[PDB]
Ligand binder design. Structure first.
Ligand code: CA
Ligand code: CA
Lengths: 717, 717
């Protein structure tokens, strides 16, 4: 047996091969079993019965074709290597200024006599978790191979409580379900709600990052890191033995990965602690990704706070389309200048300029505009190939005028590249599209992949599409363009390597609050799941929570109080933050809007004050390069009472604190717009009791006093 | 019923809708049945049961979802329109200076009550055949649809003799089989030989252009024209009732075409005559294609006679790869400058310069070089995605020096873009690849798609790939680049619309003469099948027919005599002609090589003197802008005796004729290099008796005397 221990001795990973040569590992935390003996390995696709060289001669051993499919047992430990790593690095943007990468490593070389080939399984043990991956060295016996299935197991020590969404190859926009592992099977049917593109794979399949809470006080998170040149990993539960196992996303032919040595699988991670706050504080995912590959990133990659012509179309008040009189359109043939405007097209110059005015007046960085280009008439569900060209504006969208105006106002326009899931079409137009952005002042783009993937047969999270998503990001970096990709595979920390990937949706966002609503506890779960691996463009900030005010036919209601929406700018971390409501609605609650105007986007420090998945999350962050702090609390269906202790503030300093909280009897459903704002003085000796209503929360801006003229007339809170 | 007659009254097409509302047509030639009553129509893929708009509301008639799949019956004639067209046009390059487009047309509008939608079937009847297609007007009830199967029938009046190759979605590189329609089923297994990428679909499936000969003296050719934005059509035979039916190529999900109205299917053609020579003379395929879309085509599109560093690798004498010491390579990682040359890499500067020297010395236009770029080590059968970058040369290939040297010699280098069937990879690199060509003096490119298509699941001839092949040609046109695409879907006359597509292989070429050989009668069939729709880069000109002389491990023998190889420059039409052997071998038979040096590539007139599929083809062509004629005869297994009458020559003129013929004892197998060359005078009163040996033929250059001094010493032949 091989034993690996964490730097603090709290975690121990034991490895060995069983009597049939199957790699097996187990993990304990403070003497408590986290991962029971679980096997590791893969099954490879069998080679063609007949495969000939160019000279029409098959020189292969046809007697070993079946044996070659086995990459899961028959292994012998040939060699082992250990090492310790302890270095700190600084992210371009993040929750803290510096991240420490400290782990003890064990690399096991496994030789498989029957196939005369070897692989390496590398384990890295941190004080907050374990990460492992398979490595395939270049060798005479292993070069090109196809993965049939990966068989990485994660054996649970009990019937834990899980916070999960249905395993799916095409969408992650599902509401979370909280249940025992043994209850997943019976709840799967109702957990799978309708979506434009979805492919569930098992009655007990779930997506990662998967969050769990054990009966013996532990919090466990299962996920992956550095998903590159490989298919996305989901988890399939054996609910008899309570074992989760890797289930990769198949391509159009059912295969799960084309490999060429030397190559590695992404890392698989088990983050664990007896303190839920430590799950949020873990940086294992980022630490397992390759260091930044954009040498000059710091010079152009920057956080973005924005508003946009968007909610109009999401709610149904306005449209992305320019005209309604065409049964379909054909780019390059349809003459839009001869079509009749539907009178609902929000992406028109005059309206866009009004948004620019608002953004500039309130200190925002950019304005997003959707529906600016030809083609939106057919954007939804037609499996249309030549759906957009990403460069031709509608008759009522003056690209140059809008650029000139935005620039004069100190605002940047955020480009929108909805692809309607037509991927070859996007790649064919990508260089021209990025050049168009460069030529017209756009340095950030929100992309999208709504609908079933084209090439038809592929899924959103297969190896093929993962290659596309990264290709788009790498090409964007060459143009010094930042990317926010919706519908893409959920993040796994690749932002460390390519900091220009400032966001993804890849989970159920605020848009669904207009499609029936999101569960009240949704934002008390996302940080423990979706946010592990990268930020989310959740688009918070809805003040008029009744969608019927935007569109009479839309009776959806946002499940939140105004105060909780403010809190999300702190509890839903992201260097990309949108104030999603329309300008006129914010102008009706300008006193509350002040927090959105004040809140920072990048941080030097983050303190997770309180955290319990599905119930509440309270976070305090220190704005980068400042002595100012921002606090936010988001609560579930039962609300939450906080007894805050501001001892994290600097001793001897005075702070101007503004508390935005739920008013008495506030309620996400019956009284969402009831809030109070209190301004006073805070110090590291201050203590405050605040109550977050059901589906409520609170936000606090804490600015260091710079001139004594600020604390005039203010009292200690 | 409706009646449509050819301009000369010889052909009659009768159209009618039967009792169940199914469109039906029949065709007669000189009162003989060519096509028995056959139905026309298509079945569409059923729409998903639950499809919703963006508002989450299904606005469809769930009761109509089943009847909407029917686009084959329940029709009624709503309107009919007739018209006559008679115009002449001039191809940029071709077999004659002018082509006449003369037909009588009948357009039938068919309304389908149950689905409240209409389609149009347009028929065009020429003196040599019928063409028809389906048209789908844009209408409220027909916009986006997917084709399940096309059901275009071609009912035969008997058990004809057919010249066919196995129906296949991935290759056409099969030898032809000559048999009765009733014998196809029993011969299919042996007809399907091994290939790098192949997907047969039926025991009675064959490909088009399909050629047949009837017992009542007719020659019938079934094919299609203008295969654009649609899947390739093959034919499936009902060998019980002798009915051929359209069988389209499926995509990765099994579907056969994504359509969007207004749209049309390609044309389906039936070329018929009681004289086989008239099948070769038909221009129906080109006439049914859209007029030229390259405005300045005449200024840059030009025929090309070339040689190349190619046969070396095909025979195994040399290699495409630079080194043999690596199990695999990774572009951007593998440092070739540090690898050991295998000493077999033919694409090296010095060797290339020698080819350029030979090309310039003998009047050739270009030199093709394969194996010039990084990556060839892994080009075959690995289903490798990032296989080539199309721009990085190997250490021993000096791009700039070769460019300078070729330019100095008045030679152009032909670029080689083998993609190894990795299509997304080629598209991602295409603009840079074409720009590289432009920057380095390459104005023509030979592309290739060897291996199973990537995206994996697609076939070489599906709608997806057809889009790619045309995309490559259209983009090339923007760079003023000519394209010769191997492994692409066989031509259907699109060269009329895009004249820069100067070639395709898309059939069994000379390369297979090194892989065991082609059938002796192969070239007596290709003009009746493969050449209908476009020229072929057959790469004739092999003088040393024993491949073991290039590589001792290769015992393949070219099934031809030297004289027949010369004939192919006239009998295998193409504006792109290669002299495929190595310079050293041509230097052994320089007297015979003279014909290859003299023969033209473009023609003002073509006279098909003799023609019988599978037995012999004799053609005389007048070189464009000259009074010179070139003649070629290719024969099958039994040879052929020709009694030539040169009355096509101009009265009163004298011609210097050189006859390259098989020796009396010549034989493709036992005595292939035995030939005679006779030079003399020819006039329109001349008559010559020539015999083509088994697998032999002959070639004749007939140059008009410009200066009497050139005829001195010459006698009449
Ligand atoms: Ca979305
Ligand atoms: Ca080929």
């Amino acid at each position: 047996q091989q034993k690996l221990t964490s730097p603090d001795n709290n975690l121990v990973m034991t490895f060995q091969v069983d009597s049939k040569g199957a790699p097996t590992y187990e993990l304990t935390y403070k003497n408590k079993v986290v991962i029971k003996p679980s096997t590791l390995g893969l099954e490879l696709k069998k080679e063609d019965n007949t495969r000939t060289d160019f000279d029409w001669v098959d020189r292969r051993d046809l007697t070993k074709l079946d044996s070659k499919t086995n990459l899961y047992d028959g292994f012998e430990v040939k060699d082992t290597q250990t090492a310790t790593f302890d270095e700190t690095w600084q992210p371009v943007w993040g929750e803290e200024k510096e991240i420490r990468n400290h782990y003890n490593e064990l690399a096991v070389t496994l030789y498989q006599p029957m196939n005369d080939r070897s692989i390496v399984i590398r384990f890295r043990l941190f004080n907050d978790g374990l990460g492992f991956r398979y490595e395939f060295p270049q060798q005479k016996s292993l070069n090109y191979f196809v993965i049939k299935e990966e068989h990485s197991q994660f054996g649970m020590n009990g019937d834990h409580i899980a916070f999960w969404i249905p395993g799916d190859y095409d969408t992650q926009e599902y509401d979370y379900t909280i249940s025992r592992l043994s209850e997943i099977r019976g709840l799967m049917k109702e957990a799978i709600t309708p979506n434009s593109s979805q492919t569930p794979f098992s009655q007990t399949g779930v997506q990662t990052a998967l969050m769990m809470k054990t009966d013996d006080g532990l919090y466990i998170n299962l996920h992956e890191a550095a998903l590159v040149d490989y298919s996305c990993m989901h988890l399939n539960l054996d609910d008899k033995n309570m074992v989760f196992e890797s289930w990769l996303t198949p391509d159009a032919k059912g295969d799960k990965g084309y490999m060429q040595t030397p190559c590695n699988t992404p890392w698989r991670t088990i983050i664990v602690s007896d303190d839920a706050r430590n799950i949020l504080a873990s940086r294992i995912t980022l630490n397992l990704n390759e260091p930044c590959k954009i040498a000059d990133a710091a010079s152009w990659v920057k956080p973005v706070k924005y508003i946009g012509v968007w909610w109009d179309m999401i709610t149904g008040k306005g449209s992305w389309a320019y005209t309604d009189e065409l049964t379909s359109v054909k780019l390059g043939e349809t003459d839009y200048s001869k079509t009749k405007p539907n009178g609902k097209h929000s992406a028109n110059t005059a309206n866009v300029k009004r948004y620019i005015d608002f953004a500039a007046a309130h200190g925002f960085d950019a304005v997003l505009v959707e529906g600016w280009n030809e083609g939106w008439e057919d954007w939804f569900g037609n499996s249309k190939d030549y759906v957009f060209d990403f460069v031709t504006p509608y008759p009522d969208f003056d690209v140059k005028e809008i650029h000139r105006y935005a620039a004069r106002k100190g605002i940047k326009m955020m480009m929108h590249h909805e692809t309607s899931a037509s991927v070859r079409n996007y790649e064919r137009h990508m260089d021209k599209a990025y050049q168009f952005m460069a030529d017209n002042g756009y340095n950030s783009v929100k992309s999208g992949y709504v609908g079933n993937i084209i090439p038809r047969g592929e899924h959103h999270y297969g190896q093929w599409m993962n290659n596309h998503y990264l290709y788009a990001v790498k090409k964007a970096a060459d143009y010094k363009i930042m990317v926010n990709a919706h519908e893409a595979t959920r993040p796994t920390g690749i932002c460390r390597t390519y900091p220009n990937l400032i966001g993804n949706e890849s989970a159920r966002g605020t848009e669904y609050e207009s499609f029936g609503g999101n569960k009240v506890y949704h934002t008390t779960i996302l940080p423990f799941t979706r946010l592990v691996g990268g930020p989310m463009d959740y688009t918070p900030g809805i003040f008029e929570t009744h969608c019927n005010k935007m569109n009479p036919a839309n009776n959806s209601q946002v499940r939140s109080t105004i105060a909780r929406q403010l809190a999300l700018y702190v509890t839903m971390y992201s260097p990309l933050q949108m104030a999603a409501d329309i300008p006129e609605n914010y102008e009706r609650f300008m006193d509350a809007f002040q927090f959105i105007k004040d809140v920072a986007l990048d941080w030097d420090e983050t303190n997770y004050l309180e955290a319990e998945p599905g119930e509440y999350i309270t976070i305090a962050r220190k704005a980068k390069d400042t002595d100012d702090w921002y606090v936010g609390c988001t609560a579930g269906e039962n609300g939450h009472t906080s007894k805050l202790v501001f001892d994290f503030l600097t001793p001897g300093k005075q702070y101007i604190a503004t508390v935005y909280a739920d008013a008495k009897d506030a309620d996400w459903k019956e009284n969402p717009q009831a809030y109070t704002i209190k301004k006073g003085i805070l110090t590291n000796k201050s203590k405050l009791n605040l109550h977050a209503a059901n589906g409520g929360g609170y936000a606090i801006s804490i600015k260091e006093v710079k001139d004594k003229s600020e604390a005039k007339g203010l009292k200690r809170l």
